[PDB]
């Protein structure tokens, strides 16, 4: 209730009550006004939090380490065009299959919780998670780290979304910067460090 709100002193929507991790009462348009869409959208925000987190790691870390002389990674922007040990198309096809397997099973768990967590081949490999979107198990919790008391996971999960939100902005940061500036993200950092009051969007 008295949890911090995005807009202090405003009245948060009723369907947001602070239970979920990262609920700062932010939903002006009420996309999660009804419970069901909220449930789906919770997943939507969750996975988007993880992909960008790798993408932020995928863009910034190599470009940083190649800006200094340690490695050779090219720009993420033209990363797709590069020619690797085979054609791009088949790798994308191979990516279509394998991801579709996890994006298939994950789909089953979403529409029907708890009906997917046992290994189809070696049935003693059952997964341990109970919350939808938190698979648990030895593959995805090699030491646990998710099986704890509340007010800790709520802290931890909020430490998972609040970072993910930080990623999704950053990668779209690297997105638009590469388009209307001619260089990588780190250059856009440095040219902003030499003359902070001059070198900005306003060139």
């Amino acid at each position: 209730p008295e949890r911090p709100i995005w807009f202090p002193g405003s009245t948060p929507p009723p369907w947001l009550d602070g239970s979920l991790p990262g609920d700062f009462g932010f939903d002006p348009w009420g996309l999660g006004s009804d419970p069901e869409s909220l449930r789906w959208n919770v997943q939507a925000e969750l996975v988007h939090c993880r992909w960008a987190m790798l993408g932020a790691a995928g863009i910034f870390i190599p470009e940083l380490l190649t800006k200094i002389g340690i490695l050779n990674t090219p720009s993420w922007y033209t990363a797709g065009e590069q020619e690797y040990f085979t054609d791009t198309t088949t790798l994308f096809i191979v990516e279509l299959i394998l991801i579709g397997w996890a994006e298939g099973r994950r789909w089953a768990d979403i529409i029907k919780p708890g009906c997917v967590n046992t290994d189809p081949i070696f049935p003693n490999n059952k997964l341990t998670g109970t919350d939808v979107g938190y698979p648990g198990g030895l593959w995805f919790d090699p030491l646990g780290y998710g099986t704890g008391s509340p007010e800790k996971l709520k802290e931890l999960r909020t430490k998972e979304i609040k970072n993910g939100r930080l990623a999704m902005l950053a990668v779209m940061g690297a997105w638009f910067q590469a388009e209307y500036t001619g260089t990588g993200p780190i250059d856009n950092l440095f040219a902003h460090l030499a003359d902070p009051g001059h070198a900005t969007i306003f060139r």
């Binding site: 009420g30 996309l31 999660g32 009804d34 869409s37």
Partner: protein, 42 residues
């Protein structure tokens, strides 16, 4: 949220969405296989 989906499901709104998709599909096919006076596959 429910009321928005219901409105989007009323007949006229589906029609433009459905036909619009249909128009896009036919235009694409004619862009890739133009003139198309016969069906010369078999």
């Amino acid at each position: 949220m429910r009321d928005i989906k219901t409105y989007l499901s009323v007949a006229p709104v589906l029609s433009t969405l459905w036909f619009g998709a249909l128009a896009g599909l036919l235009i694409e096919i004619n862009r890739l296989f133009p003139d198309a006076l016969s069906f010369p596959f078999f």
